[PDB]
């Protein structure tokens, strides 16, 4: 329902015309190729990067900031486009990494643009089971968290919220003694949650790509889809 960023599962069941079938694939390829240029020519923090990427997303009718209700069409467009592009870039190992890297970059961009307060519902809408802490709890553990903080300078516990996670999901953090652990629960700053979200998305994306490749001979039997599966790097 938060159609502006979505973990891609539950493949769709609608039916579409073949012209739209090819148009979605070519549009997704164009956008994902331009993500390469934006990520190479610029750096990940300039306003120009954000402006160009969001303008191009607007140009190709793709989902962005959630403040305007019924953009059901861009949601459907992106949902169909990802799954249709999964079939092509799953063949060669030089293309799977290319797919994953740029899709993770796009998800990073889409994550950075959520305003401030719709993030909590999204975390529950993607089967992640995370939690937040109230102000009184933040003040109770303020000294403990700032002591447990990484090389991040300053004791000032800013307005950035602190998230509460099961410890097993924070393996990359508590291994380096950079977070606070209490009652089998890890406390993390909002900056570092992006890394764990992307790391957990990557494994599922790779597993889905692998499971599609081995059951893809059955799809080559269709004679109408041969040009698409072989001419997306032509």
């Amino acid at each position: 329902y938060p159609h502006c960023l979505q973990f891609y599962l539950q493949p769709p069941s609608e039916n579409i015309s073949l012209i739209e079938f090819e148009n979605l694939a070519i549009d997704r390829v164009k956008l994902l190729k331009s993500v390469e240029n934006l990520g190479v020519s610029y750096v990940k923090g300039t306003e120009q990067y954000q402006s160009k990427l969001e303008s191009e997303l607007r140009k190709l009718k793709f989902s962005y900031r959630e403040n305007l209700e019924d953009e059901y069409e861009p949601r459907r467009r992106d949902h169909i486009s990802h799954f249709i592009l999964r079939l092509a870039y799953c063949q060669s190992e030089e293309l799977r990494r290319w797919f994953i890297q740029q899709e993770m970059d796009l998800l990073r961009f889409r994550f950075s643009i959520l305003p401030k307060d719709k993030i909590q519902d999204f975390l529950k809408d993607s089967q992640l089971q995370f939690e937040a802490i109230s102000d009184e709890e933040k003040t109770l553990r303020e000294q403990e968290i700032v002591a447990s903080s990484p090389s991040l300078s300053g004791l000032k516990l800013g307005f950035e919220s602190i998230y509460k996670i099961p410890f097993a999901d924070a393996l990359d953090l508590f291994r380096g003694r950079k977070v606070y652990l209490e009652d089998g629960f890890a406390y993390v700053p909002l900056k570092d949650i992006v890394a764990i979200i992307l790391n957990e998305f990557r494994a599922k994306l790779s597993k889905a790509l692998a499971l599609t490749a081995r059951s893809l001979p059955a799809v080559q039997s269709d004679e109408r889809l041969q040009p698409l599966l072989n001419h997306l790097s032509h």
Partner: protein
Amino acid sequence: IAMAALVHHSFALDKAAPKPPFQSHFCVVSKPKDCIFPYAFKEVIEKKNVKVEVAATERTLLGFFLAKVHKIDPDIIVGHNIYGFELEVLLQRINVCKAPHWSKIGRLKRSNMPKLGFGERNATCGRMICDVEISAKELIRCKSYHLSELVQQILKTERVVIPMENIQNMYSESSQLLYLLEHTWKDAKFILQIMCELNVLPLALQITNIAGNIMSRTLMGGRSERNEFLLLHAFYENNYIVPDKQIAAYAGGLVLDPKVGFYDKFILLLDFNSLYPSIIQEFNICFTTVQRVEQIPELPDPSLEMGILPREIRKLVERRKQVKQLMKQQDLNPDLILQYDIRQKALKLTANSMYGCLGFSYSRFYAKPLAALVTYKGREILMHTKEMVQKMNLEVIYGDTDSIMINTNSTNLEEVFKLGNKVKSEVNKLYKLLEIDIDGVFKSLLLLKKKKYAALVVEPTSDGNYVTKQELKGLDIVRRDWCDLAKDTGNFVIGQILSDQSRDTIVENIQKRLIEIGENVLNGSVPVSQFEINKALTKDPQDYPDKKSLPHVHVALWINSQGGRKVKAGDTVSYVICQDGSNLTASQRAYAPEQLQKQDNLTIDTQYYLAQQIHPVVARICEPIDGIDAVLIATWLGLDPTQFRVHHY
């Protein structure tokens, strides 16, 4: 540092091995130099009551061994790798350490000793030396000829290996030196048990009494010398003059063009008994009877009497037939049947080496035309028999220089036996001495190429009941240069294909099993020991000019340059292909089995073992069957199909 010996005084060569094999034993251990024995060792020695003598220096240990062998006066000294490393080490230690009375190692008195099996045999004059490696290589085929593999196979027991590096560590405690001494004693016991189980000495005595050579030369292997002495005795007995000592080349057998594929019906296989000796006896092929000077000589006149060669080969054939009759007996001990099988195989090789020695350019009785004539007659017999069997409205699918495979296309056993008997009688009516027999009856057969087929052999038990036994000939699963993983997968595929199930279920089963293998290989649940590839060395490792491009020699130079025991010609090397990260080719990334569990930067290369080890075997096996292709196997294993065939869009 340590030497242990076992002695028996009443070993009989005309009766089975004694039980127990030994009656006396002793052992000596010495400190290296800088270290000292752990304290309380003498008290522990008195406690456990072990016949161990502690020496001061190495020279005292050498003196003890040379003095003890004189008193024991052994006549057969049996060991492992005696001719390669042990005897040279002992003799060089005697010389450098200046031991007294080195001539005690043999049975004669000498002054100066030579150095480098010529030097060893000369230095051990008067005593037979037996090496279990040479005898095992001559009598039994295995994957590796070290002590561990021989103990694992012949004795069916696991043996603990002590590395060279850990020797220094185990000098601190008395119990560790005791463990080292006990391990040496156990190795000596294993060597003696292997010798007693293989029945090497009675076979050597019989072969030496057949050929007439010296018994010590028999234990060193080789087939030319026995034939030389046999022919020498044969010619000297009949008042002849023999040639003096010296101070591909002709057409061989005929192999028919096969019919590749899968067969569900019964197949007969007809085989000739002792083909080439039978030819020699039949056509009076001998030195005296055949004229000579690449040309095939003509057959001799049949009126002339038998020559020297067939009369001597007849005795070997008769001895083999005598052994087979004893093999026929019922209710025999399982070890006795294997001993008789080894005996008859050795006699068969002795009989068939008489033909081979006729084409050896360095032999004392070199004669190319005789071998050319016998090969020509063999080809003629095969062709004539094939024509005659085809004349009876029957099909031939394969044959290798003495055999014919007939596709009866029936399903009842009595009629196929009757047809085999009829063809046997028709074939045997023509010749006098040559005979043909039904070697076996196949149930389902997969024939891949020439000299490559898998089958089920029908073994009757009683009252028309029969069991099936799987057999392979020439496949990639029977060779030592493939990983155990690929061999096991290929064996599973062969077992599935030859089953009685419907053709639909086998494809699904293969797909499931291949998917499971693909997942497990990447998961890493398969042990390291199943990733080993074993290859034998022909020349010395330093002598290879292409050392860079060959993996096994690359491992051999390393294991020589850092390790202990030095690998020489004839030994086997085990190598595994791993990830180094230097971006070199696969053949330049070979590493030792111990080089992986010790270092950290190396890991098993799954891509090589999944795209070049497993896939080729299963692709070659399933070629004659439909529904399976290389691209399908590639997709099932989780590989990229783009490499193998694909291409057209």
